[PDB]
RNA sequence: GCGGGGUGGAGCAGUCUGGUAGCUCGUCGGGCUCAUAACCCGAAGGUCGUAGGUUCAAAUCCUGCCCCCGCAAC
RNA sequence: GAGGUAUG
RNA sequence: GCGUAAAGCGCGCGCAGGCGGUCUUUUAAGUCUGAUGUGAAAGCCCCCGGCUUAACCGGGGAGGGUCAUUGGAAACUGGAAGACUGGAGUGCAGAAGAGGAGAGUGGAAUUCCACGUGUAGCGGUGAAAUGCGUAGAUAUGUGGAGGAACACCAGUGGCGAAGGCGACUCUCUGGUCUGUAACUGACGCUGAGGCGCGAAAGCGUGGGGAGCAAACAGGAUUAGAUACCCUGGUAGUCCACGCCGUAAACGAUGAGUGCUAAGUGUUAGGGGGUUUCCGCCCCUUAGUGCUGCAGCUAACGCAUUAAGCACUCCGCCUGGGGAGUACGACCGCAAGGUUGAAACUCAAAGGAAUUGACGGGGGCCCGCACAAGCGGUGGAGCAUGUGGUUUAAUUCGAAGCAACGCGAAGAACCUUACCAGGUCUUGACAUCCUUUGACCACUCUGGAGACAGAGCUUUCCCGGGACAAAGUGACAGGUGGUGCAUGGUUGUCGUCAGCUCGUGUCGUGAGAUGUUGGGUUAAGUCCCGCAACGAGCGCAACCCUUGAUUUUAGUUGCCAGCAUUUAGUUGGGCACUCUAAAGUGACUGCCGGUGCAAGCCGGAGGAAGGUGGGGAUGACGUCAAAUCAUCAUGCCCCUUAUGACCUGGGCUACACACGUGCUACAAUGGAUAGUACAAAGGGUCGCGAAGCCGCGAGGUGGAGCUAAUCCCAUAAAACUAUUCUCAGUUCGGAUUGUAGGCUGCAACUCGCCUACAUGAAGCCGGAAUCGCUAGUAAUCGUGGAUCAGCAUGCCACGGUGAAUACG
C-alpha cells in the first residue's frame, strides 16, 4: 500500500509544527519568506548537520532556532557566522533577525541527520547494506527503542530498481503515542537518484 | 446457336395466379465476458440486370439489349 | 492409517 | 543398474550350458611354488656420461609372458572310488479347495407367443422429441418357447505357473499343505535356443441368438456435433473345431536358497497345558493381509509375502523422438505378430517430493456479493467527459475492476503547452567577467500587438552594498523524449487479516514448524492443546468528532425570576442555553444461564452496551498499474530552434457510440398568495444593509463590519387557503427571435442571468445494469473552494425520513 507521512499524521497531536506564528493578510508573505529562509539555510548549512529549524514571529523580528548537532560550525572560532546569517537574512526578510543555535545530543536520534549520513555514503559509492546497518547500530546504541530504514533506486547501478529495508526494534507507525521521527533524503548517482527513508521510534 | 438464370453481401424462394418484398447464413449497433466467439436485445441494407412498352398500378405480363453457368459450334 | 462396494 | 526414472520375457515344461549339501582316500585338469631357458635392438622407466644447456645422443641396468620344460604341496574348484542325511523325491496317516475337461441337471429373472380382465396412455430427458399404443397397449394373471449368466453364501477368503476360475450332481484328472523318519541317497537350482498354454477383441466353417451392443438410422444437443444423451439396432457376444498369440498380460516388483526385531487379524494343519466335552492359552508348519524396528531407497515407501544382508542362474536397459518404424527373415487365410536399425533432429526428456496459483474437487467462514426490499441508469431532453471522425490546430496525459463530471478546486484574451501569422537570438528566465551607472516612467508617430523612431525625463545609497543598460563568451532554455532507468506521491487487492523473523527442532534437501488443530472473535482477537518458545509488521487500543454531565469563565452569546423597547431593545443577572478548557462516565465493570475456559446469550443501571456511532489510520508485496505535465532527476535529442515574445484562432468542432449526472415524463402534482422551523460556513478593499428606481436580471446608495457584534442570508421542501380536474395538460421545459442587465479593454467563434413570445422531445423506459442495512437510501434547499465573470461538477451542511434481511 501507501503510507501516510508519520510526521503529518502527528502534527497537532504530539508534535508542534515548526513554522510557528499567527497571521492574517501577512500569511502567504510570511510563508514564502520562511521557505526562502529554509532554502538559504539548507543551501549554506547542509554540511553543518543542520536538522531542525523553528521559526517565530513578533515585533517584526524574524526569530529562529536552529537545532544542530555541531554548533561549532554554525558558530565557533570566528563568531561571525551567525552575524553573516542575520545580515543576509535581513537582506531577504526586509526585517530584523535573531538566531538561536541549539545543540542536539545523540545526533543519531534524528532521522534527517541519519538520512544525510546514508545519502553521503551512497554518493561516495558505499554499500547500501553497510550504510543502513551501521546507521541502525549507531541509533540503537545512541538510545533508539526502534529504527527502520530503506533505500529505493537503481541500487548498485542496476537497470531494474527495487527496495531494501531493514529494521531493529519496535517501530509502530499506527500508534500515535510514539514520538516518532521520520525523514526522506536524496542521493545522486551517475545512474540516477536514490531515495533514502528513515524513521526512529524514541524513548518516552 | 439451345437451355437455365440476373431479387440487400452469399445461397434460395416469390413470377405461372399484377397490388403482398420473404427463409437461412451474414453485416452494423448495444448488452454478457478481462477480451474474441457463441448467446440475448434492436436496426439497417434490395426500385428485383438494363431500356422501353401494357396496366390505375409490374420483381410479376410483352419486346430488345447486356451479363453469368452449362451444352453445342469453333 | 489403509483396502472393498470453445479460445487467448 | 530394472516398484514408480530406460530396463523382469505374460507364464510355464524343459535339451544344451552355468552353478552345486557334509565326510574319507587318490590324483594333480585348474591353482600355488623352486630351478633353467628365452621374451631382439631401439622405445617407456632408473643410474652415469657427452653435445655452450635443452632437444638430442651414448653406456649400463630394470621391467614386461593367463611364456615353456622340469621338479614339489594338496587347502579350494575339477576328475575318480566309497560313505552319510537337514536339500530333493517316494512311501505312510490326514486336511482344504470357484484347479482343469466332459455329460447332465435347477430356479430366479430379461424378452417373445397365446388367452382372459382392461382404457388411453407408456417410454425417456437437464427439458424434450424420435418411438410403441384404440388393428388395444402400458400393466395384471395364467400357461408355453427360447437362449445368456448364475443373488444370498461371498470375505484385502480358496485354488491355479500365469491367463483366470463362483448354481448343483456324477465321471476323468492335476497340483498344494500338515505330521512321520519308514525308503532312495544330491537324484538339485536356473535355463539361452526349442515346445506348449495364454484375458478381451478379431478370423474361417456350421449352428444358436434371449438380452446388451460396436457400425448404422432417426430424434435432441450444439455455433457446428461424423460424440456424450434418447429411442431402435447389424457384426458380435454363446457353443463345436481350428487360427490369431496381444494387453495398465500389473504386485508396473524374474525363479531358487539361507539369514536379519516385533504387534495383529484371517485361512488350512499339527503339538502340548487346563478343563465334563465345549472353551481358553502357548509353541510350530505352509498361505494370506494390516501396522511397524534395523537396514535400503532420490524420495514415496519396502520391511520374514523386503524394494534388507549374501550366493547361483536367466532375461532386459544405456538420453528424448524418429520407431517398435524401414530393409531382411520367420509365423499368420487375413487382421497383423516376433526379431529389429540408421539417416535426421533436440539440449533436454523424465521420477519423487516442496512451496504456491488454479480447479465446471470437497469442507468451514466473511463482505450490499447474492437473496429480500427501496430508489435509480439503459429509453427522452440537456450538462460533462471519453472514443471515432473531421480539422491549419482540434495540446498533452489516464484506458477492465483500478481510464472516461478523471489531472482541470473555473479553456473569452491570459491560462494554453497546440495551430496561422508577424518577429528575437547570451535570449522571456539565472551566475560569472568588462564598461558604466539609477534602471526606468509618461506623451507623440508607424503599428494587430510584440515592437522601431523621437521627445520629455532615471533621484542608486554609505572603495563598499543592492539592483540596472550595453558588450562579451562560458552558459541558458525546452509542458522534447523514455513512468520498461528513477526518486517521491498515488490507486489497487483490502482496513482483507493476514506477511514475516531470531533461537530451537524435523527433513539429505528445497522446505516445514511456529502461522496448523478444537473453540471463539469484526480481527493469526483471545483460551485449551501441540516441537516449539518468543518477537516484529499489521488487528485492537492511544488521536479527532458525535452522544449525557460537573467545575472554570460569561461577551459579540443567554433571558428564568424582573421592569420597559419596534426590536434581547436598555438596565440588570449568568438561571438556562450557547461557547470551550480541564474532568467524569461505558470498562463485559456487576447479576442470571451455559461453557472447563476463552468467551456466548439474556438482564439491570445509565444518556449511551457490548470495538456505543462516524472518521482518519491502508502490513510484506501484486498489477514492470499511473505520474519525466507538480517537482526534482540519469541518458538521449533541438539549442539564430523541439527555445522566446505578440496578435488572432483551437482545447467549446460533429454523421455516430459509451460512461457519469441534471431536468422531466405529473394530481403524494403545478400556478398564485400567506407563512413556521436549519446547520455548517465566507468577508478589506472584501461582505455589502436600510431606503429608493426598475416587470425583472440589476442599478443607486452607502449603514454596520477586520466580524458569536454587521453583512452574504427571504432557507426550501412542510403547512395553510384558492384555482387547475387527470388532459401532451397551466405537465415539461429545449430550441429559436427581439429587447435588457452584469463582468470584464473586450461576451461572433465562446460566459452567465432576466423579460416577452415560440413552445420541442418525453404519457415511466429492450437485452442488461447500479447504490443502499439507519437518521442510512430517497428528497429538499444552503454554504465553501477555485473565481473579475463563468457548475447539473466537487467537498461539507442541516431539514424531512422510510422498506427489508428468510437465509
Ligand atoms: K465367429
Ligand atoms: K489381471
Ligand atoms: Mg409489386
Ligand atoms: Mg482455456
Ligand atoms: Mg519404467
Ligand atoms: Mg628391448
Ligand atoms: Mg473371443
Ligand atoms: Mg437483490
Ligand atoms: Mg439517457
Ligand atoms: Mg484526449
Ligand atoms: Mg510505473
Ligand atoms: Mg503512461
Ligand atoms: Mg487501528
Ligand atoms: Mg507500464
Ligand atoms: Mg477538454
Ligand atoms: Mg445478513
Amino acid at each position: 500500500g501507501q503510507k501516510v507521512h508519520p510526521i503529518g499524521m502527528r502534527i497537532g497531536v504530539i508534535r508542534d509544527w515548526d513554522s510557528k506564528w499567527y497571521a492574517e493578510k501577512d500569511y502567504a508573505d510570511f510563508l514564502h519568506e520562511d521557505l526562502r529562509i529554509r532554502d538559504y539555510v539548507a543551501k549554506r548549512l547542509s554540511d553543518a548537520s543542520v536538522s531542525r529549524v523553528e521559526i517565530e514571529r513578533a515585533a517584526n523580528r524574524v526569530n529562529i532556532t536552529i537545532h544542530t548537532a555541531k554548533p561549532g560550525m554554525v558558530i565557533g572560532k570566528g563568531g561571525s557566522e551567525v552575524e553573516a546569517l542575520r545580515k543576509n537574512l535581513n537582506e531577504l526578510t526586509q526585517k530584523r533577525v535573531h538566531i538561536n543555535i541549539v545543540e542536539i545530543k545523540r545526533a543519531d536520534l534524528d532521522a534527517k541527520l541519519v538520512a544525510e549520513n546514508i545519502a553521503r555514503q551512497l554518493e561516495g559509492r558505499v554499500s547500501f547494506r553497510r550504510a543502513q546497518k551501521q546507521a541502525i547500530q549507531r541509533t540503537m546504541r545512541a538510545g533508539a527503542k526502534g529504527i527502520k530504514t530503506q533505500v529505493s533506486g537503481r541500487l548498485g547501478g542496476a537497470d531494474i530498481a527495487r527496495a531494501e529495508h531493514y529494521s531493529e526494534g519496535t517501530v509502530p507507525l499506527h500508534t500515535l503515542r510514539a514520538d516518532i521521527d521520520y525523514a526522506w533524503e536524496e542521493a545522486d548517482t551517475t545512474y540516477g537518484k536514490l531515495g533514502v527513508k528513515v524513521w526512529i521510534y524514541r524513548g518516552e
Side-chain angles (χ1 to χ4, degrees):
Chain A
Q2 298 295 322
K3 301 292 186 294
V4 71
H5 207 284
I7 293 168
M9 192 66 204
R10 289 172 180 85
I11 300 295
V13 181
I14 192 166
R15 186 175 291 183
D16 299 331
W17 55 81
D18 296 330
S19 295
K20 285 184 288 300
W21 66 86
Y22 188 91
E24 291 181 355
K25 294 185 182 175
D26 299 331
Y27 187 95
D29 295 331
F30 291 182
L31 185 154
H32 289 273
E33 191 184 8
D34 292 331
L35 290 176
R36 289 190 293 282
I37 288 169
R38 291 185 176 95
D39 297 332
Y40 185 85
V41 170
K43 182 71 176 178
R44 291 172 66 91
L45 303 171
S46 177
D47 191 357
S49 71
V50 175
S51 79
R52 185 178 179 180
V53 179
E54 289 173 351
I55 288 168
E56 288 293 336
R57 285 280 185 280
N60 197 12
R61 186 176 61 173
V62 168
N63 289 326
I64 299 174
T65 79
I66 297 169
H67 297 82
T68 305
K70 68 188 291 186
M73 188 174 289
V74 179
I75 52 164
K77 183 68 180 181
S80 67
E81 294 288 330
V82 295
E83 297 296 331
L85 281 178
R86 68 181 294 162
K87 185 177 181 183
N88 294 313
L89 294 174
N90 287 323
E91 178 62 23
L92 293 179
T93 56
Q94 192 63 45
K95 297 181 176 66
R96 293 184 68 94
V97 181
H98 180 64
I99 304 165
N100 291 324
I101 297 98
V102 180
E103 180 175 358
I104 287 164
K105 297 182 283 292
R106 294 173 173 181
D108 298 335
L109 288 179
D110 192 351
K112 179 67 178 171
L113 291 171
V114 171
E116 284 190 352
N117 184 6
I118 296 163
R120 298 289 180 188
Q121 289 178 354
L122 296 172
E123 295 183 356
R125 196 179 289 119
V126 177
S127 62
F128 58 88
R129 277 72 175 270
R130 185 173 177 265
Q132 293 171 353
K133 289 185 183 173
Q134 293 300 111
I136 287 172
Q137 288 180 358
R138 288 179 181 179
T139 61
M140 297 296 288
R141 290 176 189 264
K145 288 182 182 173
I147 181 65
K148 180 169 170 186
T149 63
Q150 71 182 353
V151 163
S152 69
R154 293 180 68 178
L155 284 68
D159 292 329
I160 292 168
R162 78 278 180 191
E164 294 296 325
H165 62 278
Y166 296 102
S167 65
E168 292 186 354
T170 63
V171 190
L173 299 172
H174 292 261
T175 58
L176 298 166
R177 288 190 284 111
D179 291 331
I180 291 167
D181 195 354
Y182 172 86
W184 173 64
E185 191 70 30
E186 54 185 355
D188 191 358
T189 66
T190 63
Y191 295 103
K193 193 184 290 298
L194 299 173
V196 185
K197 289 183 179 179
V198 182
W199 52 85
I200 301 158
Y201 178 81
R202 293 178 292 173
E204 290 181 353

